[PDB]
């Protein structure tokens, strides 16, 4: 069977408490106005005619919904193949408790739960159990006490809809529930209630099949007890598959989900998901996405596994002085900066240019590392713009520097009682220095009078002044070993990226790919372009890229927009009505179905603009109105024409 599923099934995205906000999350929700199955049930026969619908495939989620009573439906069977393969989640509801035993069960083709009479049992109902066959390897076995089937009891409980949403998204089987009565004489409510959170038993087994478990009073495998009330029964369980879609959920002051927008529906939903509101006004508003709904995210970040020897350029025998900085060029590495926080807590981790944290994602080309030691009084002079003693006549740093200077105290080994006279610095220079220079000159400086001809006499001295560190000095004079990391970004294949894992390269399908920091959403197809273009003349002020290079193999992939074409929605305000209009900028009223791909969209949009009441406009094809050959007043700017709309009627 097939019916219409009204707007219902919106759950809480995450567990973070929020209020009076509008968060547009991207999870596995139920598409509004979808086609759910009103699968009924029968009785009498146990072997073949036990029900009406066989096992249903579990793709991403199931929106369970039943309106029966007397506790008929008290179970939801989950599993991959359900036959001695993987752990089968068996959520069997009981009189007072609910068993969520995740164990290996051999579910037969006809799973039924015989009705057990209410007596004093051993805190469970294992007396009547013919749904499964065996159980050997039992995993986590949540035994939550509160009833899962029903919550409250009243006179409107007979029409109460016990709805449940299931999803095993990488670690947690998020279950939801909302036990609310329906108005008398209605199968599905016309409200916009939301399912409250529930148990989150952590599992990791994949689910590919779903089966609704029913109950029977007495079975005899005869047609006489098929539909009689006693020893028989019948029920219905609505099933709706969840697809990846974006939803804008409204929050109240008490932290509950209010009315939401499908955002994958009639173009008014895309108008709601581009203004982040719920009451739109009269105005031509553009839409970009949320109508193709990509399903998989490609990373393909690294190509190597060898860790980077950052410890080699961070803890050596003895770093050189300030006038000779050891530049160790590092390439073909893995940028794992997690070891930078769990080894000898430093003084100041000041990362300029880029954010101090979130460095394990942004990938660079080559990473340089310096190594010198200065006093504590000048640990801040090594920074973009800062001047002083070591920042005027020694190692410096440019204004634009997307690196991270890091220092730490070293009074332990870099200071002796007698005096560590090895470390020296330059203070006698004629002119200034330029960034990344190594002046190792050991000449004699003289600028006040005639040169001493290199004798170091009166008013003539050596530029290197031994500032030997002593343990009796204060924290301002203690030696500090400072490493100046330099992160370059050249137009070359990157060699040192973060520890991000790899994925599968999906072709000819809308995905969310982030190869080397180029976060872009688009269909990746194979192109005949010889080499990857490098747009640098116009700088691409209001334009994005069109092609990227795969970091694993040297293949040239082309970035094509999934569903676009310059779609501008015309809505005369949600306050007036819900009669939206669609405008496609740059079509010819014949290429519109192939432009926005009118083949894998929502059925509510396959009737709004395909070929009905089209009009050829200079900007494109305004589909959704009628070109009335009359005169009107100023309306929403479409580009041309003031023809029929929600005005005047």
């Amino acid at each position: 069977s097939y019916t219409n599923s009204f707007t219902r099934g919106v759950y809480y995205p995450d567990k973070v408490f929020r209020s009076s906000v509008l968060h547009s999350t991207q999870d596995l929700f139920l598409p509004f106005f979808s086609n759910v199955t009103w699968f009924h049930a029968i009785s009498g026969t146990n072997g073949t005619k036990r029900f009406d619908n066989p096992v249903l495939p579990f793709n991403d989620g199931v929106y369970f919904a039943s309106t029966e009573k007397s506790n008929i439906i008290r179970g939801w069977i989950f599993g991959t193949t359900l036959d001695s393969k993987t752990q089968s989640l068996l959520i069997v509801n009981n009189a007072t408790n609910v068993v969520i035993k995740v164990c290996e069960f051999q579910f037969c083709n006809d799973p039924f739960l015989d009705v057990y009479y209410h007596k004093n049992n051993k805190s469970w109902m294992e007396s009547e159990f013919r749904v499964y066959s065996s159980a050997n390897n039992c995993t986590f076995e949540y035994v939550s006490q509160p009833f899962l089937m029903d919550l409250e009891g009243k006179q409107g409980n007979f029409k109460n809809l016990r709805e449940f949403v299931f999803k095993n998204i990488d670690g947690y089987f998020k279950i939801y529930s909302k036990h609310t009565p329906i108005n008398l004489g209605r199968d599905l409510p016309q409200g916009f209630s939301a399912l409250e959170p529930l148990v989150d038993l952590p599992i990791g087994i994949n689910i590919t099949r779903f089966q609704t478990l029913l109950a029977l009073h007495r079975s005899y495998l005869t047609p006489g007890d098929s539909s009689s009330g006693w020893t028989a029964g019948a029920a219905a369980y609505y099933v709706g598959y969840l697809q990846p879609r974006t939803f804008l959920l409204k929050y109240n002051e008490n932290g509950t989900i209010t009315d939401a927008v499908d955002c994958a529906l009639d173009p008014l939903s895309e108008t709601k998901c581009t203004l982040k509101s719920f009451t739109v006004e009269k105005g031509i508003y553009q839409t970009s996405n949320f109508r193709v709904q990509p399903t998989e995210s490609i990373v393909r970040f690294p190509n190597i596994t060898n860790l980077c020897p950052f410890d080699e350029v961070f803890n050596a025998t003895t770093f050189a002085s300030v006038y000779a900085w050891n530049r160790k060029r590092i390439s073909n590495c893995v940028a794992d900066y997690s070891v930078l926080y769990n080894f000898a807590p430093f003084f100041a981790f000041k990362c300029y240019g880029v954010s101090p944290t979130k460095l394990n994602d942004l990938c660079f080309t080559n990473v340089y590392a310096d190594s010198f030691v200065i006093r504590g009084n000048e640990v801040s002079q090594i920074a973009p713009g800062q001047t002083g003693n070591i920042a005027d006549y020694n190692y410096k740093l440019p204004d634009d520097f997307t690196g991270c200077v890091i220092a730490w105290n070293s009074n332990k080994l870099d200071s002796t009682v007698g005096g560590n006279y090895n470390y020296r610095y330059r203070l006698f220079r004629k002119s200034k220095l330029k960034p990344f220079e190594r002046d190792i000159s050991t000449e004699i400086y003289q600028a006040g009078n005639k040169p001493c001809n290199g004798v170091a006499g009166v008013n003539c001295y050596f530029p290197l002044q031994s500032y030997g560190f002593r343990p009796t000095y204060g924290v301002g004079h203690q030696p500090y070993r400072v490493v100046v990391l330099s992160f370059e970004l050249l137009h070359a294949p990157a060699t040192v990226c973060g520890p991000k894992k790899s994925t599968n390269l999906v072709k000819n399908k809308c995905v969310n790919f982030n190869f080397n920091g180029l976060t872009g959403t688009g269909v990746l197809t194979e192109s005949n372009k010889k080499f990857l273009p490098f747009q640098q003349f116009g700088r691409d002020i209001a334009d994005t890229t069109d092609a990227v290079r795969d970091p694993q193999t040297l293949e040239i992939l082309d970035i094509t927009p999934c569903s676009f074409g310059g779609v501008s929605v015309i809505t005369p305000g949600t306050n007036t009505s819900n009669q939206v209009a669609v405008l496609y900028q740059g079509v010819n009223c014949t290429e519109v179905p192939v432009a926005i791909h009118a083949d894998q969209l929502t059925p509510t949009w396959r009737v709004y603009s395909t070929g009905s009441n089209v009009f050829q406009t200079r900007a494109g094809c305004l589909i959704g109105a009628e070109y009335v050959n009359n005169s009107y007043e100023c309306d929403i700017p479409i580009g041309a024409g003031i023809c029929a709309s929600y005005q005047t009627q």
Epitope: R327, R329, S331, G353, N366, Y368, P398, D400, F401, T402, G403, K434, P435, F436, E437, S486, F487, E488, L489, L490, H491, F534, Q536, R539
Partner: nanobody, 119 residues
Framework: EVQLVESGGGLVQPGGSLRLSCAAS????????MSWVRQAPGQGLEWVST????????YYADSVKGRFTISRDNSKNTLYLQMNSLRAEDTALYYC?????????????WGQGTLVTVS
């Protein structure tokens, strides 16, 4: 504000070689990495090879990997580009630009350019 005057070759024969030249006058920066950009008629512009300014590393492209060699010398403040084995595909107007290693991918010292064709 430095102008990168380019020279070295205007026309060559298929299967030959000719050294180019890119001299910078007011080039006080010693870390700005220099590179070459070729724009053939038809499709857009591509990348030939770059020279790291912080050190002395040189990175080449995939088509000109083992046929093009580069060299930099700050004493005379110029850039040289060799063109060994120009068989059939090295027909483009090569440009000499310069950008900082720390920043965006766009250049900041777009020069005039020089044409090199083999036919």
């Amino acid at each position: 504000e430095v102008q990168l005057v380019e020279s070295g070759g205007g026309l060559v024969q298929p299967g030959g070689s000719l050294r180019l030249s890119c001299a910078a006058s007011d080039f006080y920066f010693d870390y700005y990495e220099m590179s070459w950009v070729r724009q053939a008629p038809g499709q857009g512009l591509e990348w030939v090879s770059t020279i790291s300014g912080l050190g002395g590393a040189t990175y080449y492209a995939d088509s000109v990997k083992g046929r093009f060699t580069i060299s930099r010398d700050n004493s005379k403040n110029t850039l040289y580009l060799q063109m060994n084995s120009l068989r059939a595909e090295d027909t483009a107007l090569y440009y000499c630009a310069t950008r900082s290693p720390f920043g965006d991918y766009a250049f900041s010292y777009w020069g005039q350019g020089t044409l090199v064709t083999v036919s």
